Structures are given as structure tokens and as C-alpha cells.
Amino acid sequence: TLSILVAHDLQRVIGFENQLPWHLPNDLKHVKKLSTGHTLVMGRKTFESIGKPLPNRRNVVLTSDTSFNVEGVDVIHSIEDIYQLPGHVFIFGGQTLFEEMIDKVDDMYITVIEGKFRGDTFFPPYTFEDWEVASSVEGKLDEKNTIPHTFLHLIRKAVPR
């Protein structure tokens, strides 16, 4: 399976100055739960932002840098390399990867952050006309998680007739 994994706000902002614009621990727990034991594919900037590989799953970084070498990270140099990756693969970001992959993935795990943040990077537009809502679950609010948010699992609709 090839899936997108992303958090975007009401205007599809996903990032600002190479960081997530929001502080929302529950979404990172969501990410952890979904991707543990599987594979993350991310652009070089997204990797450098996180700073190191995330434990207990395969970290794959897409970059044109042939000198790129990071312990615990596997490197690829073209989109076509993604399709050779075994198992469940999650497109992890950032803007560039999402734009390149949104027309190619089976499904998307989207956390909608129900707010409006200042951003400099965005998820591509999409329409629910193309995507079935396999599930929609409101995130729980509390002390450490103060921004309303919704976990969507979207599956690409088949065009029939």
C-alpha cells in the first residue's frame, strides 16, 4: 500500500519555516501509531527538520544529493524508487513530495487542524468528490492538545460506468 500521511489546516497549510506551525502532541502520536513497523518516505527538507530518523520503522529520504548519508536512513534519488519499496509506505512530506505523489497514492491519512495558521508550505488542493471518507474521528482536546483536529482516512474513489 502507498499512502499519504499529513496534517494540514483549514487552508491546507502544512508548514512554516521548515517546522510544523502547530503544537499538537496527539497528532504525532497518531503518526507514530500508523507508521510504526512500516516505511516513511520524505523529502530532504522534511528530514532535516526532524533531525534524525524516527525509531522503529524504515526512514527513506528522497534527495538529489548523492553524498547524502545518514546512519539509520535509506536514501533514494527518484520518485520511481518509491514503487520498489516493500510493504506499507507512507508519503511523509513535505509540500514537494505531496505534490508529486497525490495523484499516485491509494489513500490518505489526513489530520485536519481546525484552525488558520501562517504558512509557507501547503498540501495540494483536492476534492471529496474524488475521495471516500473511510473514517472521520474527532481528536480529543485537553491540556496538551488545545487545537481542534479531525483524523480522516480517505480512499480514492473509482470512476465507473
Ligand X SMILES: NC(=O)c1ccc[n+]([C@@H]2O[C@H](COP(=O)([O-])OP(=O)(O)OC[C@H]3O[C@@H](n4cnc5c(N)ncnc54)[C@H](OP(=O)(O)O)[C@@H]3O)[C@@H](O)[C@H]2O)c1
Annotated binding-site ranges for NADP(+) = 6-7, 14-19, 43-46, 62-65, 92-97, 100, 121
Site for ligand X in 45-64 (CB under 6 A): 45-46, 49, 62-64
26 touching ligand X, by CB under 6 A? no
Distance CA 47, CA 137 (A): 28
56 touching ligand RAR, by CB under 6 A? yes
Neighbours of 72 (CB within 10 A): 10
Is there a cis peptide before residue 115, judged by omega within 30 degrees of 0? no
Q: Which does 32 bind (CB under 5 to 8 A by kind): ligand RAR, ligand X, none?
A: ligand RAR
Q: Which of 26, 28, 74, 100 is the binder for ligand X (CB under 6 A)?
A: 100
82 touching ligand X, by CB under 6 A? no
27 touching ligand RAR, by CB under 6 A? yes
| H-state helical runs in the chain | 25-35, 44-50, 95-101
How far apart are the two ends of the chain, measured CA to CA in Å? 26
Nearest to 150 by CA among 120, 124, 118, 111: 111
> Which residues lie near ligand RAR (CB under 6 A)?
5-7, 19-20, 27-29, 31-32, 46, 49-50, 54-56, 92-93, 111
